[PDB]
């Protein structure tokens, strides 16, 4: 069949290490993947004919497309004799912040992801909150003081 | 009895100008405050016979103490007579991000608190992963080798 790893963790715990360890070691590494390629890739990689029998996933979990757990994932594998081996990477506050502040300096685009990895868990997280909300003040592009400006206003 | 509004939002959105506004407006601010605190401060406040018939809550959110919604926050109200009002404060990303760089040079603390909270949403979000990874690599304190060494011997 397929041996199935999927890898994910916090910003800068070291899931592209991880990627780097598995691709070393032989896997298939496809990267910031959403879960539904998982299924459409092991089944196309069935139908193809591939040599390819060992697959790791680096999941994109910042996308609307996906619910909070994996247990979707597990079952349809479990549908075609395939248990997904699951990889976390994680690390204290203060290690995530010093690899952050190293990313600035060295890896610019790396800590631009972080950030949007972060918004977009706070996006998420915040999404029920969001939808009950009475008012919804969107501040985008306003300066300090037209940021008090427009929220004076939408309060009266 | 009393008026209640909730104020919450994304890191660098304008919560913390809203609350200032509120202020302002005459209410007395609660600010951090996960929502537990809100009814036993209304029960307080009403067997306190005080003054303050305007209470906003910046809500803490980023906090294993708090649920995804707030539904059990209004029924709880509701068994009160009280309505809430929630405000949800929210901004592009390339205007948070702006916003997260000017605080790295004004107001450092707060770009602190910006990282802090980014990380809390990601592990609340993560944590069903979490639940049912095989394996958990904690690389707290590890250098950019040292993390890769870590990796190795946990994949054998």
């Known amino acids: 069949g397929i ?25 298939y590494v496809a990267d910031n993947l959403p879960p539904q390629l998982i299924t459409r890739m092991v089944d196309f990689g069935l139908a193809a004919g591939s040599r390819i029998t060992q697959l790791a996933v680096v999941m994109d979990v910042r996308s609307r497309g996906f619910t909070g757990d994996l247990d979707s994932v597990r079952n349809e594998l479990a549908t075609r004799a395939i248990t997904p081996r699951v990889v976390f990477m994680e690390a204290s506050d203060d290690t995530l912040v010093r690899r952050y502040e190293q990313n600035r300096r060295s890896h610019p685009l790396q800590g631009e992801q972080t950030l949007a990895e972060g918004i977009a868990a706070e996006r998420r997280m915040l999404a029920p909150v969001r939808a009950t909300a009475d008012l919804i003040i969107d501040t985008s592009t306003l300066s300090v003081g037209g940021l008090r400006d427009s929220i004076e206003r939408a309060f009266g």
């Not at 041996?3 to 896997?27: F, I, P, Q, Y």
């Open 3 to 27: 041996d199935v790893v999927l890898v994910t963790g916090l910003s800068g715990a070291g899931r592209g290490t991880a990627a780097k360890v598995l691709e070393d070691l032989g896997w």
